[PDB]
Amino acid sequence: TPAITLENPDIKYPLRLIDKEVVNHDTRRFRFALPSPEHILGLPVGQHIYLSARIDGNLVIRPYTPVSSDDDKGFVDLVIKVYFKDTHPKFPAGGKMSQYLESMKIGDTIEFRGPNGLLVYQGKGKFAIRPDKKSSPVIKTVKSVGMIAGGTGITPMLQVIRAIMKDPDDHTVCHLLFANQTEKDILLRPELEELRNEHSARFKLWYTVDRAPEAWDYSQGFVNEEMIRDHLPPPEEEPLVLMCGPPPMIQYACLPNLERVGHPKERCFAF
Numbered sequence: 001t002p003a004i005t006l007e008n009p010d011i012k013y014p015l016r017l018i019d020k021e022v023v024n025h026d027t028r029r030f031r032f033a034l035p036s037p038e039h040i041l042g043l044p045v046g047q048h049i050y051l052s053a054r055i056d057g058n059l060v061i062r063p064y065t066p067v068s069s070d071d072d073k074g075f076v077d078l079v080i081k082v083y084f085k086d087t088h089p090k091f092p093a094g095g096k097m098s099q100y101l102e103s104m105k106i107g108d109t110i111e112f113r114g115p116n117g118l119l120v121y122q123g124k125g126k127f128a129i130r131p132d133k134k135s136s137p138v139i140k141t142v143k144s145v146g147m148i149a150g151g152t153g154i155t156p157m158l159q160v161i162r163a164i165m166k167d168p169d170d171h172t173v174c175h176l177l178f179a180n181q182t183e184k185d186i187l188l189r190p191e192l193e194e195l196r197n198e199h200s201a202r203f204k205l206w207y208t209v210d211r212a213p214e215a216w217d218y219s220q221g222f223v224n225e226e227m228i229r230d231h232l233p234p235p236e237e238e239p240l241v242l243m244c245g246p247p248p249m250i251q252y253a254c255l256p257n258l259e260r261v262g263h264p265k266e267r268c269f270a271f
């Protein structure tokens with residue numbers, strides 16, 4: 001195989017920022033060079049990395065979930081929302097690591113470590129999911145997967161979606177319900193709709209927004225029972241249901257409604 005970057009999850013690897021693209025008003029794609037154009041990251045599908053830096057006198061470590069893969073030689077892509085200072089009344093300082101990243105110049109470096117996470121997608125419908133950090137993975141193969149993502153919670157979902165669509169022999173059908181605050185907050189919309197246009201048989205796409213625009217053909221509001229019933233596969237088909245987003249989205253919007261619809265806890269996983 002190609003040379004792997006992340007050889008031990010406790011080792012730190014400083015990677016150089018080589019590109020940055022605006023995703024929307026507050027979110028960006030940050031691309032970092034791997035140690036050589038021929039290296040791969042070493043990232044089982046579904047796992048994340050951690051970035052670390054000393055910021056204003058404190059150690060700051062944060063996980064980010066690459067949207068690229070081990071097919072992508074020489075680089076790694078992160079999609080990261082910046083939490084700006086002087087914007088939200090409850091958080092006047094903004095976010096530490098995200099603003100630090102936003103301030104980086106091309107050529108600056110930051111330390112990566114990983115990979116980590118309880119879920120690994122092994123292809124052709126097969127998921128290896130550890131109950132916790134100290135247990136063996138349980139191998140669950142499914143015909144379909146429900147995905148509930150809020151905001152930047154789209155990142156692990158997009159890793160899994162892209163891995164599936166690349167393999168013409170992977171017949172797994174993904175049903176994504178993607179929640180954001182407003183229409184302009186819908187991250188990577190062109191990418192998602194390109195995936196729908198090209199893989200409609202394996203990819204079902206639905207949105208909800210807190211605040212909807214005039215003409216809107218999808219859903220509005222926090223994730224609810226109706227959305228889960230109509231836009232994720234039915235419990236009878238025993239799909240896995242994956243969730244990723246703000247903790248209250250998971251706690252108050254997803255879990256009780258997955259219960260109402262009839263998806264058993266055993267079939268559900270939160271990143």
Ligand SMILES: Cc1cc2nc3c(=O)[nH]c(=O)nc-3n(C[C@H](O)[C@H](O)[C@H](O)COP(=O)(O)OP(=O)(O)OC[C@H]3O[C@@H](n4cnc5c(N)ncnc54)[C@H](O)[C@@H]3O)c2cc1C
Binds near residue numbers: 060081096098099
């Ligand atoms: C396993 C895992 C993977 C993750 N992967 C990703 C990823 O791929 N991409 C990604 O963007 N994030 C990801 N997150 C979140 C990420 O780890 C950080 O929590 C996030 O970047 C914020 O960290 P911070 O240092 O910038 O903010 P902090 O200083 O730690 O905390 C600030 C918090 O206050 C709130 N806040 C501050 N300013 C504002 C503002 N202007 N508007 C609204 N709220 C505000 C936010 O809740 C914010 O998190 C992931 C989290 C986990 C647990």
Ligand SMILES: NC(=O)c1ccc[n+]([C@@H]2O[C@H](COP(=O)([O-])OP(=O)(O)OC[C@H]3O[C@@H](n4cnc5c(N)ncnc54)[C@H](O)[C@@H]3O)[C@@H](O)[C@H]2O)c1
Binds near residue numbers: 180223270
């Ligand atoms: N564990 C992981 O692997 C992982 C990966 C990526 C992101 N995340 C998390 O996802 C979150 C993304 O934050 P964001 O700023 O992009 O989200 P956000 O504030 O823009 O909210 C996005 C959507 O989340 C839902 N939501 C927000 N607050 C809610 C509430 N109180 N009740 C019900 N639903 C609510 C809404 O549908 C909302 O539109 C962060 O908490 C981040 O840590 C986790």
